């Protein structure tokens, strides 16, 4: 799960049913209920990629954009999340359009639930069955990655260890 060459987008994430400190330095290694001094004295694998601004959105019970539309943790949680840098692996010149996210949806999701659909969103009164012009937009939008981006826009590969 950690050394996979291909990582899926956040809207359609992978679900997969030792020592973890032999990797790169970690931007966000925090845990809830259990501590890293208690995990070694102690399972699902859900992984996706998140831009550097909203890495803090992956948290139990807080609102936002990716934490309300794509993947969000319930208020009660015992597992935790590991975030780590990926700039020379998944960012390259010209952009990386493999990593999508969903922006528009009818309502927020149930916990631990994913949605893969390209039904065109409706934001008005006239029913747009298949026309994504004005007042009707495509759900999935892509956010590329270039080496000219700053410290808050790198694609951070991330994974949660649900217990």
């Amino acid at each position, epitope marked *: 799960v950690f050394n996979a060459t291909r990582f899926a987008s956040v809207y359609a994430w992978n679900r997969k049913r030792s020592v973890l400190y032999n990797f790169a330095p970690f931007f966000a290694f925090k845990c809830y209920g259990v501590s890293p001094t208690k995990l070694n004295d102690l399972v699902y694998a859900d992984s996706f990629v998140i831009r550097g601004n909203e890495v803090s959105q992956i948290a139990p019970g807080q609102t936002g954009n990716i934490a309300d539309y794509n993947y969000k943790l319930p208020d009660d949680f015992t597992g935790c999340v590991i975030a780590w840098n990926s700039n020379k692996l998944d960012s*390259k010149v010209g952009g*990386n359009y493999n990593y999508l996210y969903r922006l528009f949806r009818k309502s927020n999701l149930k916990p631990f639930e994913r949605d893969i659909s*390209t039904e065109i969103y409706q934001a008005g009164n006239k029913p747009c069955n298949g*026309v994504a012009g004005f007042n009707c937009y495509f759900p999935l939008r892509s956010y590329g990655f270039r080496p000219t981006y700053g410290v808050g826009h790198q694609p951070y590969r991330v994974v949660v260890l649900s217990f």
Partner: antibody, heavy 126, light 109 residues
């Protein structure tokens, strides 16, 4: 960015074609290489793309089991194999670089062919 | 499920000419459409992308827009360069492959 294709040769039907193009002056691993054919008389037609960091060769539904596309990453080339070419396949062939890079299927909304190499046509008849 | 468009459009110099392009459910109106200009006997290049955007070096007189399941391209100023073939290019999800137009010929009067 510069893309150079090979020349045009005589191919009797039932034989294979040696069509290829190279990448120069830019990083070859971060850009897809789509292929576009064009018969003289009508519009363009799509073939498939190469992801030059793995082995992912997607094709169209019409020519799914007909074409053979192969990466040779050593000398930054992209090779292509068509065996038993037929009379309707007489066309000029382009390889094109798309901006960005994706290997999925629901990622082609932001893919347009930026730069194009010069074409190389193929022949028919015994 | 292929894009359809008039094979040729002719206009006098002095006003613009409009090129229309209509598509199916999975060609236009669910995905972006691009316009490609082909020099005669050479490699075609991008002229319109992202439905209102242009690369640098393209003169600010080429106009394109879409309203429903069809798209329109307008070229203002026709003296010595725009007498070439134009192509309506868009992504298709039904065929899961890139699809193109038949080819529009522009002739001045």
């Amino acid at each position: 960015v510069q893309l150079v294709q090979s020349g045009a040769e005589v191919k009797k039907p039932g034989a294979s074609v040696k069509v290829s193009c190279k990448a120069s002056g830019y990083i070859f691993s971060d850009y897809n290489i789509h292929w576009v054919r064009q018969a003289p008389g009508q519009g363009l037609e799509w073939m498939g793309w190469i992801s030059p960091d793995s082995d992912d060769t997607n094709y169209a539904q019409s020519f799914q089991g007909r074409v053979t596309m192969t990466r040779d990453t050593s000398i930054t080339t992209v090779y292509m194999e068509l065996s038993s070419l037929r009379s309707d396949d007489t066309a000029v062939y382009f390889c094109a670089r798309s901006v960005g890079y994706c290997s999925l299927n629901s990622c082609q909304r932001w893919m347009w062919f930026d730069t194009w190499g010069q074409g190389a046509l193929v022949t028919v008849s015994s | 499920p292929v894009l359809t468009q008039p094979p040729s459009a002719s206009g006098p110099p002095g006003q613009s000419v409009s090129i229309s392009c209509s598509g199916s459910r999975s060609n236009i109106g669910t995905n972006f459409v691009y316009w490609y200009q082909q020099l005669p006997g050479a490699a075609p290049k991008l002229l319109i992308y992202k439905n209102d955007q242009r690369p640098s070096g393209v003169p600010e007189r080429f106009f394109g827009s879409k309203s429903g399941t069809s798209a329109s391209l307008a070229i203002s100023g026709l003296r010595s360069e725009d007498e070439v073939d134009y192509y309506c290019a868009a992504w298709d999800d039904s065929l899961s492959g890139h699809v193109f137009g038949a080819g529009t010929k522009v002739t001045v009067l």
